[PDB]
């Protein structure tokens, strides 16, 4: 009647996976790439 | 009544994010690490 917990489970695992993966992974890419501090080869 | 909801939310979202993040993050970094390595010229 009031929806099953299956909703709160997909909603949490869904947003957490995209937000944590894109924000955390992108953070690593900028940390080692920015460490260069210079370009032009 | 007791079904350990918070426990599964952290365990499920914790492993899923650590698996795709640890394997994918290490995959891209190692790709340019070997190609941009050479050290044999």
UniProtKB/Swiss-Prot annotation, chains A, B:
Cite the record's tissue specificity text. Expressed in T-cells and plasma cells, but not in less mature B-cells.
Maturation and modification? Phosphorylated by LCK. Dephosphorylated by PTPN11.
Q: Which residue ranges run through the membrane?
A: 6-32
UniProt subcellular location:
Cell membrane
**What subunit structure does UniProt give?**
Homodimer; disulfide-linked. Interacts with DUSP14. Binds to CD80/B7-1 and CD86/B7-2/B70. Interacts with GRB2. Interacts with PIK3R1. Interacts with PRKCQ.
Q: What does this protein do?
A: Receptor that plays a role in T-cell activation, proliferation, survival and the maintenance of immune homeostasis. Functions not only as an amplifier of TCR signals but delivers unique signals that control intracellular biochemical events that alter the gene expression program of T-cells. Stimulation upon engagement of its cognate ligands CD80 or CD86 increases proliferation and expression of various cytokines in particular IL2 production in both CD4(+) and CD8(+) T-cell subsets.
Related illness: Immunodeficiency 123 with HPV-related verrucosis: An autosomal recessive immunologic disorder characterized by susceptibility to human papilloma virus (HPV) infections and the development of HPV-related common verrucosis in the first decade of life. In some patients with HPV2 infection, warts may progress to severe generalized hyperkeratotic cutaneous papillomatosis with cutaneous horns ('tree-man' phenotype). In patients with HPV4 infection, warts remains stable and may even regress with age.
**Which named protein is this?**
T-cell-specific surface glycoprotein CD28
Provenance organism = Homo sapiens (Human)
Q: Which gene encodes it?
A: CD28
Which part of the entire sequence is included in the shown chain? 148 to 188 of 220
């Amino acid at each position: 009647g009031p929806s099953k917990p299956f909703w709160v489970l997909v909603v949490v695992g869904g947003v957490l996976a995209f937000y944590s993966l894109l924000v955390t992974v992108a953070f690593i890419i900028f940390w080692v790439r920015s460490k260069r501090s210079r370009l032009l080869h």
